[PDB]
Amino acid sequence: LLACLFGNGRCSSNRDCCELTPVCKRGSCVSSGPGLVGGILGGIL
């Protein structure tokens, strides 16, 4: 298994995080998830 270069909760970019946290926001790593609620194309269904 190899999907976590650090995982210390702090990162400088998205590549500075691990698999469990594919996103790097606020100098920290978290779950990226989907884009945003509502949706830019069709906010229904």
Backbone as ProteinMPNN parsed JSONL, in Angstrom:
{"seq_chain_A": "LLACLFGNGRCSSNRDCCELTPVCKRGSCVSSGPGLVGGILGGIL", "coords_chain_A": {"N_chain_A": [[0.861, -1.217, 0.0], [0.513, 2.247, -0.762], [-0.224, 5.318, -0.387], [0.015, 7.974, 0.758], [1.904, 10.508, 1.464], [2.497, 12.107, 3.592], [0.336, 12.978, 5.66], [-0.044, 14.421, 7.935], [-1.983, 16.191, 8.547], [-1.443, 18.703, 7.67], [-0.699, 20.654, 4.78], [0.77, 21.863, 1.647], [-0.095, 21.887, -0.887], [-2.448, 20.066, -3.018], [-1.236, 17.648, -3.631], [0.247, 17.261, -1.394], [-1.091, 15.758, 0.424], [-2.882, 12.78, 1.649], [-4.361, 9.605, 0.515], [-6.838, 9.224, 1.909], [-7.404, 11.863, 2.258], [-7.837, 13.689, -0.287], [-7.775, 16.386, -0.813], [-6.406, 19.716, -0.387], [-6.834, 22.177, 1.68], [-6.841, 25.394, 3.293], [-4.25, 25.101, 4.233], [-4.281, 22.534, 5.153], [-5.229, 18.999, 5.248], [-8.063, 17.324, 3.855], [-11.258, 15.689, 3.184], [-11.964, 15.68, -0.187], [-14.393, 15.237, -1.749], [-17.487, 15.994, -3.492], [-18.089, 18.592, -6.045], [-19.647, 21.382, -5.487], [-22.57, 22.157, -3.45], [-26.032, 22.363, -4.664], [-25.252, 23.055, -7.568], [-23.792, 24.019, -10.641], [-24.844, 23.542, -13.089], [-28.012, 22.925, -13.574], [-29.865, 22.699, -10.807], [-31.392, 20.737, -9.691], [-32.548, 17.464, -8.767]], "CA_chain_A": [[0.0, 0.0, 0.0], [1.325, 3.499, -0.813], [-1.098, 6.46, -0.779], [0.075, 8.974, 1.861], [3.31, 10.997, 1.593], [2.646, 12.693, 4.958], [-0.872, 12.659, 6.478], [0.106, 15.122, 9.246], [-3.088, 17.182, 8.676], [-1.012, 20.01, 7.091], [-0.158, 20.493, 3.396], [0.992, 23.127, 0.887], [-0.896, 21.717, -2.129], [-3.258, 18.812, -2.951], [-0.289, 16.491, -3.653], [0.89, 17.127, -0.053], [-2.03, 15.041, 1.339], [-2.883, 11.301, 1.428], [-5.591, 9.114, -0.178], [-8.025, 9.562, 2.759], [-7.658, 13.324, 2.107], [-7.4, 14.105, -1.656], [-7.854, 17.87, -0.994], [-5.52, 20.505, 0.517], [-7.442, 23.53, 1.86], [-6.464, 26.039, 4.589], [-2.95, 24.509, 4.672], [-4.593, 21.262, 5.867], [-5.767, 17.964, 4.314], [-9.417, 16.848, 4.233], [-11.923, 14.907, 2.106], [-12.406, 16.563, -1.309], [-15.858, 15.034, -1.952], [-18.027, 16.516, -4.786], [-17.788, 20.036, -6.276], [-20.375, 22.217, -4.487], [-24.027, 21.837, -3.399], [-26.812, 23.087, -5.71], [-24.771, 22.623, -8.913], [-23.784, 25.15, -11.615], [-25.689, 23.129, -14.249], [-29.213, 22.183, -13.088], [-29.814, 22.542, -9.325], [-32.515, 19.831, -9.309], [-32.21, 16.023, -8.981]], "C_chain_A": [[0.884, 1.25, 0.0], [0.449, 4.657, -1.295], [-1.133, 7.485, 0.361], [1.529, 9.406, 2.054], [3.529, 11.572, 2.991], [1.447, 12.307, 5.828], [-0.755, 13.324, 7.851], [-1.002, 16.17, 9.423], [-2.681, 18.542, 8.086], [-0.414, 19.78, 5.706], [0.033, 21.85, 2.726], [0.172, 23.073, -0.406], [-1.703, 20.421, -2.005], [-2.332, 17.593, -2.917], [0.395, 16.316, -2.29], [-0.052, 16.398, 0.918], [-1.984, 13.536, 1.06], [-4.175, 10.885, 0.719], [-6.837, 9.496, 0.626], [-8.365, 11.055, 2.626], [-7.068, 13.796, 0.772], [-7.482, 15.625, -1.85], [-6.946, 18.592, 0.011], [-6.093, 21.919, 0.636], [-7.053, 24.102, 3.225], [-5.16, 25.435, 5.115], [-3.202, 23.212, 5.448], [-5.155, 20.249, 4.869], [-7.146, 17.505, 4.776], [-10.01, 16.052, 3.067], [-12.434, 15.853, 1.021], [-13.919, 16.431, -1.505], [-16.257, 15.534, -3.35], [-17.68, 17.998, -4.953], [-18.473, 20.88, -5.2], [-21.862, 21.858, -4.509], [-24.76, 22.622, -4.49], [-26.386, 22.602, -7.095], [-24.839, 23.801, -9.885], [-24.661, 24.807, -12.821], [-26.874, 22.302, -13.748], [-29.102, 21.965, -11.578], [-30.967, 21.653, -8.86], [-32.123, 18.382, -9.602], [-30.688, 15.842, -8.971]], "O_chain_A": [[1.898, 1.29, 0.697], [0.396, 4.937, -2.493], [-2.206, 7.817, 0.865], [2.292, 8.727, 2.741], [4.644, 11.522, 3.512], [1.55, 11.396, 6.649], [-1.319, 12.827, 8.826], [-0.95, 16.959, 10.366], [-3.515, 19.445, 8.016], [0.305, 18.802, 5.496], [-0.487, 22.862, 3.195], [-0.207, 24.112, -0.947], [-1.634, 19.752, -0.974], [-2.629, 16.611, -2.236], [1.06, 15.305, -2.069], [0.181, 16.428, 2.127], [-1.127, 13.076, 0.306], [-4.99, 11.738, 0.365], [-7.789, 10.037, 0.065], [-9.507, 11.451, 2.862], [-5.925, 14.25, 0.722], [-7.273, 16.102, -2.965], [-6.75, 18.116, 1.129], [-5.851, 22.76, -0.229], [-6.951, 23.36, 4.201], [-4.996, 25.279, 6.325], [-2.405, 22.844, 6.311], [-5.519, 20.622, 3.754], [-7.366, 17.317, 5.972], [-9.325, 15.78, 2.082], [-13.251, 16.731, 1.296], [-14.64, 17.427, -1.431], [-15.449, 15.495, -4.279], [-17.041, 18.585, -4.08], [-17.92, 21.066, -4.116], [-22.35, 21.309, -5.497], [-24.156, 23.458, -5.162], [-27.099, 21.817, -7.721], [-25.849, 24.503, -9.936], [-25.163, 25.706, -13.495], [-26.738, 21.099, -13.525], [-28.32, 21.127, -11.13], [-31.458, 21.812, -7.742], [-31.437, 18.114, -10.588], [-30.199, 14.724, -9.132]]}, "name": "protein", "num_of_chains": 1, "seq": "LLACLFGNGRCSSNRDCCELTPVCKRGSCVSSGPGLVGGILGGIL"}
